[PDB]
Amino acid sequence: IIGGEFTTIENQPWFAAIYRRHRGGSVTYVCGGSLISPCWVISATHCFIDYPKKEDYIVYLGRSRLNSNTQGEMKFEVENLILHKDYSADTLAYHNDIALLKIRSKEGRCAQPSRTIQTIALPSMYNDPQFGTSCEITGFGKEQSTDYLYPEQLKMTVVKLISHRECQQPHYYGSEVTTKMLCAADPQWKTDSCQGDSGGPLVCSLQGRMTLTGIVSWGRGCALKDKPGVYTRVSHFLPWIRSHT
Numbered sequence: 001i002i003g004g005e006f007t008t009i010e011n012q013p014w015f016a017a018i019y020r021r022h023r024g025g026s027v028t029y030v031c032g033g034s035l036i037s038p039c040w041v042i043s044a045t046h047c048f049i050d051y052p053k054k055e056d057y058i059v060y061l062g063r064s065r066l067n068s069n070t071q072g073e074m075k076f077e078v079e080n081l082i083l084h085k086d087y088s089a090d091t092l093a094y095h096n097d098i099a100l101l102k103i104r105s106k107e108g109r110c111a112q113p114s115r116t117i118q119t120i121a122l123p124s125m126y127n128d129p130q131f132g133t134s135c136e137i138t139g140f141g142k143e144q145s146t147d148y149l150y151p152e153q154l155k156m157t158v159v160k161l162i163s164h165r166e167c168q169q170p171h172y173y174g175s176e177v178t179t180k181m182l183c184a185a186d187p188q189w190k191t192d193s194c195q196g197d198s199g200g201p202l203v204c205s206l207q208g209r210m211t212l213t214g215i216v217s218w219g220r221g222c223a224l225k226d227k228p229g230v231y232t233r234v235s236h237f238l239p240w241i242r243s244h245t
């Protein structure tokens with residue numbers, strides 16, 4: 001996250017930290033995600049596509065920091081890693097950038113909701129807030145495009161949903177953005193998602209409720225003018241989500 005603020009897992013208690021075991025047993029951070037039910041985290045396929053073996057992965061819930069433990073956190077193995085059949089990668093844009101991890105502990109349990117661990121609602125079918133609606137994003141992604149390291153502490157910031165029509169302008173993304181995506185940006189382009197934030201939540205208040213409207217997917221650079229964040233539009237994927245859960 002570029003700009004915004006530090007936070008703690010209590011302000012995004014559905015946020016999932018996803019890591020990978022190297023051969024040799026070093027663990028690096030992969031991507032964010034969101035708990036949508038006690039056994040299921042939703043993320044971006046582009047996160048796992050290079051190393052698609054589920055045994056490689058580790059999921060934490062109730063975690064506020066990248067490389068320190070947080071009192072209350074729960075650690076999970078991936079019992080299932082479901083990548084979207086119709087995924088593709090062009091120059092910039094991921095298509096069908098959506099994945100499902102079914103989490104289970106060594107002692108064979110799903111998430112136990114707590115003050116630091118909660119689910120987030122999916123939206124109703126093809127129902128998203130109006131353009132200019134303010135939503136939140138969360139992750140351990142870079143603070144600056146140039147940064148070598150990820151932050152130790154979770155971040156969140158605020159972006160404004162951009163009209164489909166405005167995102168498709170040639171000097172934004174042209175046709176790279178389809179109806180199964182969303183754009184969001186700062187009016188001043190000064191805060192944004194970045195490398196390390198992929199798979200994480202774009203949360204909007206909808207029928208006055210905290211609702212998972214988006215999954216961080218891509219963008220050109222981070223916090224670049226006429227270069228919004230692009231999000232997987234969860235409200236065009238409920239059949240897929242229901243069908244695979």
Ligand SMILES: N=C(N)NC(=O)c1nc(-c2cc3ccccc3o2)c(N2CCCCCC2)nc1N
Nearest residue numbers: 145192193194195217218219221222223228229
């Ligand atoms: N909201 C946005 N504008 N962008 C984003 O959401 C985003 N950006 C990048 C990005 C582009 C870039 C260029 C130079 C330095 C750092 C960079 O990071 C990003 N990566 C980082 C590379 C590893 C695989 C995942 C793709 N993911 C994003 N989801």
